[PDB]
A paper describes a structure:
Type IV pili (T4P) represent one of the most common varieties of surface appendages in archaea. These filaments, assembled from small pilin proteins, can be many microns long and serve diverse functions, including adhesion, biofilm formation, motility, and intercellular communication. In this study, we present the high-resolution cryo-EM structures of the Saccharolobus islandicus REY15A mono-pilus and tri-pilus and demonstrate that archaeal type IV pilins can also polymerize into dramatically different filament structures.
The cells grown in rich medium (MTSVY), produced a single variety of T4P which were very similar to the adhesive Aap pili previously reported for S. islandicus LAL14/16, with a slightly improved resolution (3.9 Å versus 4.1 Å). We denote this type of T4P as mono-pilus (see below). The mono-pilus has an asymmetrical unit containing a single pilin with a helical rise of ~4.95 Å and a helical rotation of ~104.8°, displaying a slightly right-handed 7-start feature, similar to the Aap pilus of S. islandicus LAL14/1. The REY15A mono-pilus structure adopts the known archaeal T4P two-domain fold, featuring a long N-terminal α-helix and a C-terminal globular Ig-like β-strand-rich domain. In the mono-pilus, the inner helix of a mono-pilin S0 interacts with outer domains from pilins S+4, S+7, and S+11, resulting in a total buried surface of approximately 873 Å2. In the mono-pilus, the outer domains are densely packed. The outer domain of S0 interacts with six other outer domains, exhibiting an extensive total buried surface area of 1,574 Å2. Three out of those six interfaces are unique (with the other three related by symmetry), with buried surface area ranging from 236 to 300 Å2. Previous work has demonstrated that a closely related mono-pilus exhibits remarkable stability under extremely harsh conditions, such as boiling in GuCl or pepsin digestion. This can be attributed to the fact that the inner hydrophobic helices of the mono-pilus are completely encased by the outer domains, which are further armored by heavy glycosylation. Under conditions of nutrient limitation, S. islandicus REY15A cells predominantly express tri-pili, although mono-pili and flagella are also present at low levels; however, in the rich medium, the cells exclusively express the mono-pilus.
Residue numbers in the entry: 13 to 143
The structure:
Amino acid sequence: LSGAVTALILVIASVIIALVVVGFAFGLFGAFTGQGTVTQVGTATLSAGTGTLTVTLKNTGAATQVTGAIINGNAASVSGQVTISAGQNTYSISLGGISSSTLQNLVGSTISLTLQLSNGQTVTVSAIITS
C-alpha cells in the first residue's frame, strides 16, 4: 500500500514545485522587461568653466539613478539632479574630480561620455564642450 501513497505524495509535490518554478520564471520575465531602459536623445552640452552636463536621457522603466561617470579614463563623481525620473527630460548633472585646466582648452570640441547607472547598464553620451 506504501507504493501508491508515495506515488501520489511525490506527484502532488512535483505539481507544487513545477507551478512554483513556472510562476517564478514568469515573474522574472516581468521584472526584466520593465527593468529600466535608458538611452540618449539629442546632444549634451558640457560646461568647461565648472563642469555641468546638460544631457537629455529618455528612460522607459524604473526610476534609476546615475552613480558615476568616466571622463578621460578617470573615475568621476556625480552630484546634482541625480535621480532619473521616468519620461524624457532635460537633466542638469554636475561632474567632479577633473582639473579645470585640461578641459578648458577644448572649448568648442566634441568628446564622448559614459554615465554609471544604478540598474547595471551604462549609457554612452556624446557631448559638445561649451564655456
